[PDB]
């Protein structure tokens, strides 16, 4: 019945992705089925010409990066394609082949952009969401893939100059990398990697003291707390920890957040030892 007619329409939309004359409408309809159709990612991945058609939408926006000329209509169409790629990135049947094809690298030109226009800010936000869905799988394969790319410097620049939503996702991505044992060891491997992160995190604390954000501060504190697990990083944090994290600067913005207050108390306790 209706379950059948919906599945037949999805197969029709997937085939319509291969034609430029019908791809825009197919992108719109399929992105609506991202949450309700658990088998969507294998159906997209089944023919690689479908994935090539999705990537063609991605590649078509590269000329809009310099100078930043991306419009809201152009950004919305590609974000729909990114939403379908996010489906493939998070499904356990397609996640490994998705990483083996290095598909996330097609999004890195978007993450490298610095334009503060809304079409680019939301393009980075949706692009960060694809990476965010990858680290939510809690797979070792995801962390190893991200460490062989330049995702850390891309996230750090967004964490200091992006919008609040983009800073939150970018900080969450860094948080998930740090929570992995190899990711923490990677950032503490050299002086430059750790100092770059500590400088960015400290700058965000300064920005948060002027414009408070409970959701962003939660992930910043979690990054600091995880860094304190490394002995060399713990000694460095005893000297460079922002005073706003030791004072009652954020007591009002955390008046209802019991989780961040517990992490902040654990962080200062890890540094006193």
């Amino acid at each position: 019945g209706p379950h059948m007619l919906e599945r037949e329409k999805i197969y029709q939309w997937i085939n319509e992705l291969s034609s430029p004359e019908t791809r825009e409408n197919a992108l719109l309809e399929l992105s609506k089925k991202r949450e309700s159709v658990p088998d969507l990612a294998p159906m997209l991945w089944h023919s690689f010409g479908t994935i090539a058609a999705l990537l063609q939408e991605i590649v078509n926006i590269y000329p809009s990066i310099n100078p930043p000329t991306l419009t809201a209509h152009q950004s919305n169409r590609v974000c729909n394609a990114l939403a379908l790629l996010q489906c493939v990135a998070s499904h356990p049947e397609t996640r490994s082949a998705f990483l083996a094809a290095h598909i996330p690298l097609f999004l890195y030109p978007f993450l490298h952009t610095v334009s503060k226009t809304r079409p680019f800010e939301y393009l980075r936000l949706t692009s960060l969401g694809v990476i965010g869905a990858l680290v939510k799988t809690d797979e070792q394969e995801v962390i190893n893939f991200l460490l062989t790319t330049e995702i850390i410097p891309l996230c750090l620049r967004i964490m200091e100059s992006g919008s609040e939503l983009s800073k939150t996702v970018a900080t969450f991505i860094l948080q998930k990398i740090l929570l992995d044992d190899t990711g923490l060891a990677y950032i503490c491997q050299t002086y430059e990697r750790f100092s770059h992160v500590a400088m960015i995190l400290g700058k965000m604390v300064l920005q948060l003291s002027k414009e408070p954000s409970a959701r962003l501060l939660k992930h910043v504190v979690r990054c600091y707390l995880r860094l304190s697990d490394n002995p060399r990083a713990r000694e460095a944090l005893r000297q460079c920890l922002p005073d706003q994290l030791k004072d009652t600067t954020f007591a009002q913005v955390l008046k209802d957040d019991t989780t961040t207050k517990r992490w902040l108390a654990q962080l200062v306790k890890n540094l006193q030892e």
Partner: peptide, 25 residues
Amino acid sequence: DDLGFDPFVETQKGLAELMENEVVQ
């Protein structure tokens, strides 16, 4: 392990207003 929001849903919300305020008569 969550952000408190959906980045793609918030993108659709933000770009819907700008798409209507960028087009020409």
